[PDB]
Amino acid sequence: GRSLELGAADIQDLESFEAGRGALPARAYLQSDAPRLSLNGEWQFRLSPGSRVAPDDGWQLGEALNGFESLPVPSSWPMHGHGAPAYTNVQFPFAVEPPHVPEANPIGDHLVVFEAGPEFFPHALLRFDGIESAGTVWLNGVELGTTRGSRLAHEFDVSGILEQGENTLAVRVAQFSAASYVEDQAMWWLPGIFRDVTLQARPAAGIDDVFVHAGYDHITGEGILKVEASRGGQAIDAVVRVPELALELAAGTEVRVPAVEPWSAEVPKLYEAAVSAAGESVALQIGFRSIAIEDAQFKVNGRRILLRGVNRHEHHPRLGRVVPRDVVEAELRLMKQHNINAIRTSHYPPHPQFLALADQLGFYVVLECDLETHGFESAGWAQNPSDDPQWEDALVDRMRRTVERDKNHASVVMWSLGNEAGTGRNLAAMSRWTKDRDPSRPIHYEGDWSSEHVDVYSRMYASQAETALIGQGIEPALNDAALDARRRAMPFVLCEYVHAMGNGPGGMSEYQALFEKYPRLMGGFVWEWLEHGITVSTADGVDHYGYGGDFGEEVHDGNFVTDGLVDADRRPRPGLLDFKKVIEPLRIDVARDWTGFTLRNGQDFADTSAFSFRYEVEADGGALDGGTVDVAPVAPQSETVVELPGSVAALAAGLSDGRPAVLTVRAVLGADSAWADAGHEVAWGQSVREPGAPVPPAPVEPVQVQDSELTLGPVVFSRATGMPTSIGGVPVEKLGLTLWWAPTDNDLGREWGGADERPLATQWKDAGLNRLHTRLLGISANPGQDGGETLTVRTRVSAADKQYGVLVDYTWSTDGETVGLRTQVRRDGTWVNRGFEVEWARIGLEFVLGEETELVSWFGQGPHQSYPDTGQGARAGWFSLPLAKMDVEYVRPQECGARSGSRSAALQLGGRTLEICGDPFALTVRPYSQDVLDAAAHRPDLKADGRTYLYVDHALRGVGTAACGPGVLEQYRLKPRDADFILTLKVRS
Amino acid sequence: GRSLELGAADIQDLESFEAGRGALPARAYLQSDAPRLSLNGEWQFRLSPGSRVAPDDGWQLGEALNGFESLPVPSSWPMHGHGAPAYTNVQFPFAVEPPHVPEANPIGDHLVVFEAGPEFFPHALLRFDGIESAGTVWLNGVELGTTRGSRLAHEFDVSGILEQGENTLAVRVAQFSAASYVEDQAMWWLPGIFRDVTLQARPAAGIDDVFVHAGYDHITGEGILKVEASRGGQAIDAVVRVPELALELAAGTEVRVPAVEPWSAEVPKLYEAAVSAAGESVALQIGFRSIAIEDAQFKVNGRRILLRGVNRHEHHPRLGRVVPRDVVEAELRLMKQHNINAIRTSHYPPHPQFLALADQLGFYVVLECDLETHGFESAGWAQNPSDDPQWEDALVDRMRRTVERDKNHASVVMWSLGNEAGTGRNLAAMSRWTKDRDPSRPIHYEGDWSSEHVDVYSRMYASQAETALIGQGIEPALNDAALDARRRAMPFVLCEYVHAMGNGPGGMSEYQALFEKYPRLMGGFVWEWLEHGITVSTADGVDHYGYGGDFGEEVHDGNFVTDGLVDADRRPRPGLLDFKKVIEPLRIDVARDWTGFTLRNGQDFADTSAFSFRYEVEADGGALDGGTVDVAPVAPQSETVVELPGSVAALAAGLSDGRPAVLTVRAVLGADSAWADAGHEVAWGQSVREPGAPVPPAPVEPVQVQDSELTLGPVVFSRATGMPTSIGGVPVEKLGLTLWWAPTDNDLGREWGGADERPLATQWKDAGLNRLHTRLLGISANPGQDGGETLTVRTRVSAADKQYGVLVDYTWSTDGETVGLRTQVRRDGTWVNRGFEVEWARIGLEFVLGEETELVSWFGQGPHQSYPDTGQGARAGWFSLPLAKMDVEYVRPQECGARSGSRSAALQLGGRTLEICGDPFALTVRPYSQDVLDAAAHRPDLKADGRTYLYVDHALRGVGTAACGPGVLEQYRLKPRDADFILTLKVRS
């Protein structure tokens, strides 16, 4: 009675704890003059549901094709119809029982035929830069070996197997393997041969590996150069020549270059280099820079740096893991254009080509190993591979391949062991290995807060408050004295902070102020650069992004995959516009009297010589004056006071009091850079001469009384409801108090702290703020001027089954041309529900107008949105936008589009224009209601009903980052209070 | 500057705390020989959204009609297109700020013209038996008065206003008023003139009110009769004659009748009576019964009674509050047919005609005042009308009208102050008033547990455990000694228990055993009699019931309105079938050896003389023997041992051992009653000779091996999955372990107790029991008999992201004809999730068959469903049903249809029959999956996919009553364990 189950052999392999077999030693990615054929293109492809039904029908030989169809390689095959993508955050999509794999395991058989010329004989290899998750490779029917480490390179010798003429490469890829357990990143599950496949000749007397060592002596200005070269693992004779520095030297010997221009993210100086053997030459780019930890500060080339970073995942809306080069270059430019200078490769090594672009454009790169076991946390870390001895060789291998591939690039300033893999022996082994191999780069890892085997203390999403304690060196001690002394001598980095999901992130300014002032604080990497949205079309042809659950997942985490500063197509979100301003490398403080501005050079190495300093004075009627001022270069971390031309300040005093005028000073690129054109804005500051409060109009018009209607100048009232039915010509369907907004993504996250951990959204629903009703208490006229009179309308607003409420009194007035509106809000009972105090989203007014708005203009902060704890990038000025462009295209619709700090506004309804003025208020205009906004799950759910929903707010709440990390900060919370505010309305034409 | 708001006058009235104005004194509902014209029929109707827009256009005069359309009176107008019904449980549908009302307040103007003949002059009145919630009445343009108390009667004098010839009655009804705050029952909000409107002549020398006093002296057998009669509030001369007792006496004098036949729910003896004045005579039905509380026992006519009760709401699927008389009679018969003997009029007085039917058919009635302020609880009872002095006159009035209307009916044995209105002064005033007016009926009220102003200690939904402590008189003491001594001397009643929502109720037997054994325990009233479903049709024409939220409610409580023993059309639910058995008034215990049966008379007054005692012996081939046995009448609360004919026991021994046979003894009506025909079943008992366990077939067939398939006799296997693909002819698409069922309504209720209060449904979702996956571990043959061999298939079942699981081993065998299946379940890790132990719905198997089942037959318990803590009414026998009739039509689909205690089963798939045998297992067969069941919100969502989903269970969980009250009891819980069970399969034809 033997065993009868099928495919037991393949499964035994997939469940193996060993690293792949049969591969050549891990080595660096090198630009080589050796022959090379890329096998990329259209391959043939067969998909099987599982190992047990995967045919064993000699398909490796590539003849008598059965069931194979065309597929482009590289690819993430679920992006091409085969199966579907699937997204989970923490959770695994399969039963947690390592190393085992589920029966439903997509198996993808790949096959391609290619011609091998004589230049690839006698010796050659095949190189796979990435296969998710488990590869088995055959060449002409013979097994080469297997691959483990989905984002790591593998090379297989094909000497004596490759044959002159055509050849048949066959690759079986399984989605799930034992390696899946250690690749649980928060992202889509996407199997396939998703990176370059290459045939490379390996001539005799060639160069297999090279290790560049380019240090900088910031005292003397010397460069410290040693370039190791090896073959088959042994050091070899080779000459390395760098023409610009006039050097010819032998590999393996360290020399001292008298003077070098150091490399930095700010000034990425690179020297072209070649290291040559008789049979092969490899070309290099050398950046001289030394990394050191000193006095609890992370220093480069002798200077503490500030990391302005983002977390970079590799994703493409239509192609999955495959990110085309032109997209990589574009997004890296876009980062530079937004003052970013650092990248964490969350949480696996990137495409090999990435590293050279980083060297060239200038980023401080945290290079992270492909390791994460986060789904074990929910079980108390039981069975965690990070501390299971059987997993040691697999994890050491992952780190080795990571380090070896990218070790020659000046842009890599930290090696990271992985992400959210807990604590354990194997993580210590990975660190010990790295410290031995490359002592030149400090080691990062957040998972072990004791920081026992790292060189920098890292955390994710620590509050502004805890960050400030750490900055001062007074955080709580570890229980072990020896470890505590060590950790307090380490600088501190936030490897993930200010979670950028939906509307937000809020609180960026408070983190940034701490980064300045506290040297120990290295900076932070925003989570994250890009939304992982997957494009999906409908019959009519409109496009929207799909998120967790939109692809039939049984187990998923919704829209958490869409949590980035740009959308999947790299279109900015407002968060990115704000982030740019927060991390601006120059500070510009315009003097109130407009005689000049304080300039502080926030850069770490460069001066101000690359910048042109320009000023403009703008008024309602357009620009009044402008020019450019000369600024002696300001050294790093230094500052001076720059005078402006006297004509500017003379113009300030000449303004009739009450007239609005904005002075803007901008720091712009004087010349084209490799990442932007001349005229690109880097930093800016403003001084505003505000317009005085608008005069309340004289109440000289009387209220004429009719049976069902009241009229007071241009505004008609319903005598039953007491609210306006029209103002001027434009009809009004509803007017009421607002206290609620359609929850943001942050509003849906849990409010950790106290006995109340309900999401703010849930607190609102329970309290009933979404379902407010208003009761009329009375309508009354009162004596005004010269026979005229005011109209007062008293209401009380509350919710069903609730006793608490607010008294709302509207007192109206008009002189015939402009309407005067005063609003008074009074608390009635105690605003408590289910034992906890109710907070408000806002204190404002909803105008539901009976006609559509084609265009919205305002004086205030813009062009893009701004909420109390955001809008850093919204500047003062005059703005005008079509209605569609007022909105923000978040993948899940939610509260957005508010323009805080508005002094005046103009809506254009057909041939009529509604003006709104008064003390600072927030502006929002939409073609749909709040209820349909909150109900919508995707953009297509948003329907214009033919109305205008106008929102005027006397107060707003913050947005925070409660989806992950701190909620709204104290100073931006909005607890129930009493309030009063005045507005003025007008209809012209 | 005066006030300009509209409709302030009407609103001032609606917000009044006073009882209606202008009405005649509250008095009894009386059958009178005075002329009378019912105004019921088609009236004219105009609906306005609110008071402020309700026209004041002299519509009362009934001429120049504008906007009026036909409407039948009585009615609940939202049931007739105008507006829509709306259901909330606790919560009010409007802002809680008494006495105020919302702006959105439907106002219904009603108008009818009628002819008044000379017989209605000089004096007459108009009578309204119910207007929800605020009436204003005009006759010929003059205001008569207003009404408050939606379920209470009101009478208005029309002398000098009524005119000979035609007359125009006009009634404005507002849905919401100050009275709404005190009418917050859990039910639909349905305004309208929903009860009879009548014109009654009031001749001179007539009789306005009458108060019958008919006591019984259980020692002597005497009746104690005094019939009061009055006019204009003063006692008057009148003769009262009762022909059957040969009595002629003057009203106002108490006499002693030598012998009377007492009245009870069991024997509702009624004596026809008339009390006559010169101008008017009123006919009466007198039931002689005395009510008394003695030795902490609620006694009638000297004997402690047992209340077998239901809570009766008034509802009709298409007509709302209007319940047609033929429906009332039908449902009251249906109650009697299910052994019910008591009714609580939850929570308002019923239609006046109700009381006579109760007197006639025989129910102990708890008559409840129209009062409930339950929506104030969530605010700590702040602003509760029950303790607000301004509400005293309105609430005293409610009680007065309640008592006065129904005070002549022997069926009313308790007056109840209302329901869930908290505690306060006005409730004490209502009690003081009642105790003064009618000392003959003890007072009920649950809201005040101290029981300071009541005569019985009442509770709702107290656990079986607390009920048992109360039964023994050892419950915790009140802090006040004086009140505690009082309360411990009171008998105890559950005014609501065993909540009958969805599948259930469970735990009825445990309550009932306590009711026996503990005299102090009065019994209980099930919540509730009927589901409040509202019929709603679709284009294709199918009907389904609507529940909270299906009618566009902004605020609602879902399907809680559907929580009854019958559906809105009085079709029984399984709960009713079980309840009948639990409260059966006779106990029948058949002897194992079939020589006789123990008979215990559980009745309180009657003997067994009304019953015929019949026996039958049933076998697989039909009935074997039957007859009827003579039983000397058994006295109340007594018992005897009845012998059966010797042929029965001789037949028992003659059965070949292993053959199944069922002896059933039934107590049936020997003669027609007023509530059922002769042959109606009241009680029953059984003794079963079980069929021995089925022999496992000899494993003499070998397993033949092929590439993709395995065969072992009639069963074909997939060699990849290891599961059967067919058995005999019938295809099998899936076979797996089950641990989960589609949550019941109870499963959705919170598990009060411990730090885990997540509904069991939520505990399951978090633990992943709904999303199980199975992994194949191995397939193996093993030596059997005479060359044959078994097939063992090892699997492990778990869920994604979870580590805990069960090992499932299937060992198969066959001798060619019948298949032998053994299943072994082993716990792997610890079954804990989010810090709490996971429980299971079931341990069973899902067979997904590739063909439809036309008919399902089984030997076991039936015909209807049965779960571990239900199925009391499922009896042993042989049953056969079409597939559709296996299912249960709960309004929200949910787990149902299981037949526990099954020994054998037969599914008929086309021309083939699948037999299943083995140790006791539960049977369920459905044409749709569990996922579509759990997904469905209404019956139309259930779609047959063309398959058969068969469920065989070795263990089930209870269902409990966690939707409101106790969850599943300890003994019926199902914690994770190891398990083993055997089955035998066969396909014939």
Author numbering:
A (entry chain A), B (entry chain A): 22 to 1010
Show passages lifted from the paper.
Psychrophilic β-d-galactosidase from Arthrobacter sp. 32cB is an interesting candidate for industrial use, as it can hydrolyze lactose at rate comparable to mesophilic βDG from Kluyveromyces lactis. Furthermore, it exhibits additional transglycosylation activity, it catalyzes synthesis of GOS and HOS, for example: lactulose and alkyl glycosides. The functional dimer of ArthβDG has two independent active sites. Each of them is located on the top of TIM-barrel Domain 3 and is constituted of residues from both subunits of the dimer.
The ArthβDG_E517Q exhibited no catalytic activity, whereas activity of mutant ArthβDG_D207A was severely depleted. In the case of mutant ArthβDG_D207A, where a larger side chain was substituted with alanine residue, the change in active site size and shape was introduced. Especially surprising was the gravity of mutation of D207 to alanine, which is part of Domain 1. It is situated on the top of a part of Domain 1, which inserts itself in a space between the top of Domain 3 TIM-barrel and highly flexible C-terminal region of Domain 3, and constitutes bottom of the active site, which means that its mutation to alanine has a significant impact on active site volume.
